[PDB]
Amino acid sequence: MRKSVIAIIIIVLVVLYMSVFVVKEGERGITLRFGKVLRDDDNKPLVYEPGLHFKI
Amino acid sequence: RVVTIAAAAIVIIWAASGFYTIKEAER
């Protein structure tokens, strides 16, 4: 039960590191899943404020 | 049982090669 725990920890950490992305102050981010953009608040395109956000 | 394995392989190939994505600007 020693290889499995370190393996799950390291893969979880690398998955989280891949997931996180930061939008710089001067820019704004648009997210694309497959082709389309994410829609929110009654089918309105969403733009990311310059803050840390999580992507799949 | 090899025929069942072949059927599983062909249906998996059918499912995997069928999916496609098109960009937002495109239709």
From TrEMBL, chain B:
Taxonomic placement: Bacteria, Pseudomonadati, Pseudomonadota, Gammaproteobacteria, Enterobacterales
Gene name linked to the record: hflK
Localization, UniProt: Membrane
Protein name: Protein HflK
Domain of life: Bacteria
Family stated for the protein in its record: Belongs to the band 7/mec-2 family. HflK subfamily.
UniProt function note: HflC and HflK could encode or regulate a protease.
Parts of the chain that traverse the membrane: 2-22
Organism of this sequence: Escherichia coli
Subunit structure: HflC and HflK may interact to form a multimeric complex.
